Amino acid sequence: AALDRGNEQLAREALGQRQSYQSHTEALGKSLGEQRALVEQVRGQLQKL
Amino acid sequence: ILELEAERELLNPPPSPLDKKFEQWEEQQAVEATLAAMKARRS
Amino acid sequence: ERKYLELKSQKNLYLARLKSAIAAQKIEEIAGNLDNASASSLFERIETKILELEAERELLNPPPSPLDKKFEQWEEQQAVEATLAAMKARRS
Amino acid sequence: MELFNRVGRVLKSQLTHWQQQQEAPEDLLERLLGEMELELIELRRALAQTIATFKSTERQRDAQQLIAQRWYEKAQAALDRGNEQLAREALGQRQSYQSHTEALGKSLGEQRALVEQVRGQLQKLERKYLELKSQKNLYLARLKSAIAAQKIEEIAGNLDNASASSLFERIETK
Amino acid sequence: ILELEAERELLNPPPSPLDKKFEQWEEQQAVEATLAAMKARRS
């Protein structure tokens, strides 16, 4: 609702603050997906072993 | 103090004038393109 | 008297910068202990140690070949189609 | 041997060097991060010391302007009754305090940048410290996994050839 | 006293000028929009 009432200036400031946290989400998000392969493959070894 | 901080510059390379532009240049999209979805989604 | 007090004010300000700098010196001097030829490079040494060990498995236990990747997949096609061929014919 | 006498001549010191190696650099890595926690608070207190001083000068600016305001308070009605001579004397006294206000005022604004930038470093640095700590266990686990996955397949060598499962083939020959 | 309170500022970050506006700006709705229902419900 920040953009409401046609006060876009307030919305721009809030959105700019959002991107700071988004970068962590992207950097953290990719790592979580990458780590999924590691846990699965090691478990595959254990089951086979 | 001047001696020590310079070690950080070599040890940790500082942002370049290009990386000042990349962040700002992509920030324009990061604010406009993001707000472009805003001005279209919640239009 | 004004000069004496005025100087005293700056004493702590740059003792704080000196304290900040030295407290901001050890933190980034430690940062050197992270990245290169240091803990986070030993972090890259252990991975190399990991690389050394797994190679022993490859020699000690030969890995699947690209042919054995195809044999399993190629026969898997029958193992799924030929098996399902009986399924699509038995339970038709 | 020359070297051998040195090892025995200081065995305590040479065993400490071995302790450094057998204490894995990961094991020392843990203690390394402990020292950073000591410094992080030191920077935390060091920064607060800077915060204390700059606003302390802010009150001094407030105090001086209030006195100048007090002189201005007299100037509020000093000019009245057409006795400008009295007003001139009071105004002249005001400028003495104004100079401090200008000199002190500029410093307060300048110091604002210093406190903000140093805090920016702390916020950026604190994230870096925790971020690294997260990876510590992840690869200690891979190191633990690898070493725990090293002995298991190094043992696998003890099975197949010239080993237990070859002695398994020796007994058959027997 | 000045030294100690600054620890709170670092330890507990204070409200920002933006968060002064967010609360006030949304308070306008929180009073007007809420009262908008009031002036419409109990009209």
Contacting residues for C90 by C-beta, under 8 A, at least 6 apart: none
- Is residue D49 within 8 A of residue C16, CB to CB? The reply is yes
- Is residue E3 within 8 A of residue D53, CB to CB? The reply is no
Helix crossing, D84-160 with A8-48: angle to 10°?
20
Closest CA to C60 of D91, D160, B34, E33: D160
**How far apart, in Å, do the first and last CA atoms of chain C sit?**
107
Cα–Cα distance measured from residue E43 to residue A36, given in angstroms and rounded to the nearest whole number: 59
- Number of separate helices (H) and strands (E) present in chain B: 2, 0
- Is residue E21 within 8 A of residue A14, CB to CB? The reply is no
Cα–Cα distance measured from residue B1 to residue C25, given in angstroms and rounded to the nearest whole number: 8
Per DSSP, E17 falls in state: H
Number of neighbouring beta carbons within 10 Å of residue C45: 14
- Is residue D145 within 8 A of residue C47, CB to CB? The reply is no
Give the chain E residue nearest A13 (alpha carbons). E18
Q: Is D161 left (phi over 0), alpha (psi -120 to 50) or beta?
A: beta
Closest CA to C45 of D4, E8, D26, E25: D26
Cα–Cα distance measured from residue C54 to residue D156, given in angstroms and rounded to the nearest whole number: 12
Structure resolution in Å?
4.6
Cα–Cα distance measured from residue E29 to residue E35, given in angstroms and rounded to the nearest whole number: 9
Contacts of A13-21 with CB under 8 Å at 24 or more apart are: A13/E18, A14/E18, A14/E22, A15/B31, A15/B34, A15/B35, A15/B38, A16/B27, A16/B31, A17/E18, A18/B34, A19/B27, A19/B30, A19/B31, A19/B34
Cα–Cα distance measured from residue A10 to residue A14, given in angstroms and rounded to the nearest whole number: 6
- Is residue B31 within 8 A of residue A12, CB to CB? The reply is yes
Scanning A1-20 for CB atoms below 8 A from E yields 1-2, 7, 10, 13-14, 17
Cα–Cα distance measured from residue B26 to residue A38, given in angstroms and rounded to the nearest whole number: 33
Query: In chain C, helix, strand, coil percent, each to 5?
Result: 90, 0, 10
Contact at CB, D145 and A42, closer than 8 angstroms: yes
Count residue pairs from D and E with Cβ separation < 8 A: 18
| φ/ψ (deg, to 5) at D39 | -75, -40
Closest CA to A19 of B35, D31, E38: B35
Question: What stretches of D48-143 adopt beta strand conformation (E)?
Answer: none
- Is residue D153 within 8 A of residue C56, CB to CB? The reply is yes
Maximum C-alpha span of chain C: 108
- Is residue D53 within 8 A of residue D118, CB to CB? The reply is no
Cα–Cα distance measured from residue D65 to residue D94, given in angstroms and rounded to the nearest whole number: 9
Write out the two tokens for C92.
């038709």
Contact at CB, D36 and C30, closer than 8 angstroms: yes
Q: Residue type at D34? A: G
Cα–Cα distance measured from residue D14 to residue D145, given in angstroms and rounded to the nearest whole number: 30
- Torsion, Cα D105 D107 D112 D117, to 10 degrees, reads 160
Angle at D78 between CA D75 and CA D84, to 5 degrees: 110
- Is residue C16 within 8 A of residue D50, CB to CB? The reply is yes
Write out the two tokens for D26.
């990961």
- Is residue E7 within 8 A of residue D51, CB to CB? The reply is no
Residues of B in contact with C35 (CB under 8 A): 11
Closest CA to D50 of D106, D104, D119, D101: D119
Angle at E30 between CA A9 and CA A12, to 5 degrees: 15
